[PDB]
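Can't attach files on this board, so I'm pasting raw text. These are the components:
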Amino acid sequence: GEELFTGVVPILIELDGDVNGHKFFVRGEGEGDATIGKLSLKFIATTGKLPVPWPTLVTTLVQAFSRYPDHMKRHDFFKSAMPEGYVQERTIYFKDDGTYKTRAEVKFCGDHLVNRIELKGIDFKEDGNILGHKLEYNFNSHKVYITADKQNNGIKANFTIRHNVEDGSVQLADHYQQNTPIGDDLPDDHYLSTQTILSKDLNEKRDHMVLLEYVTAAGI
Amino acid sequence: GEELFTGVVPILIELDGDVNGHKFFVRGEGEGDATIGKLSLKFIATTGKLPVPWPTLVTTLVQAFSRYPDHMKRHDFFKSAMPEGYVQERTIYFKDDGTYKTRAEVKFCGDHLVNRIELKGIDFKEDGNILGHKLEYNFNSHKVYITADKQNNGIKANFTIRHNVEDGSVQLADHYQQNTPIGVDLPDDHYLSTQTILSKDLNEKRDHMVLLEYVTAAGI
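---
Top answer:
Structure tokens for the assembled complex are below.
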């Protein structure tokens, strides 16, 4: 449950996407250290150039690696679902634009932690910030609000992602999320505050993304 | 357990190896399709350059994805063990050289079929076809003979593997495996006829192997 998240864990990520009829596949790879909250991953677009901006995919592509202080270890639903893992469903609303519908399995296929995601995006404006590729290669820091569901013995989360546009404006992305266990902790109201860096591999010819995250828990 | 294989299934493999003291790790990723019997996978050595040739690891690294025709479905042991899974133990005798001892766990992990493997190779000649890396980046077509092991509630299999050598000569490798259920249809004597292509990913800078297989059952 948590003994798995001592030390460093190799991570494998697979995204299967479809936005307005445009299909694409992404394979991620790297390491996570939940004890310090660190994520280090390289993503690869295995279908050529993406039909959507890389930052719009950041939230969808391992909250189990968030750092919970010892006084909040009770409230770590994510880890305690391991190995068996959990389903993570999201509907992501982009203001004045399309929406993403996602469903993911975050499970321990045992040496690696694996996140496999189905993504379908609909009703995106072709000259909007998304399909028009007008979003900066950035990612601001957000709080992620977590509450519990006795009903599915899972959790729910609410947060808004602020995407930087080349204008200097902000593209808002409202996230609504459900996490339920794949098989048999439930937390008090608390939040995850996230940080993210986006970069490139200067020797990578395919459309890719290098990502670094530090997520720690708080609010209790 | 034919239900789980009606379509395409994502496959993730892990090989933990030690051949003549040389430790190494191989991650495998890709998908299978047992309705046509196709495997398309990519393997990565996360450990550095392999001490052994990639063809010597091909058999160790999902028969459950073999194609059984409608009239042979009563002999498909591998699929009947799903998703609970089976243990596959092998001993591989390389003619006039060392030997492989492999133990594997082939079981379902969410939507993934997972193959966790332990491999130990001993008594290899350093200037032989294996440690000396003399085997062509190749794989021949074989017949994998399967019989029932009623005492074991599973199946035994026996086959001969023909590795091409740079010589123009052949390196024989005698395979003996015992497949036992974790958590099954019983099979008359039949065989699996196999075909395999080995290739590279030009964008992958680590020691790797891209694999593609077509396996069909016959003999009844």
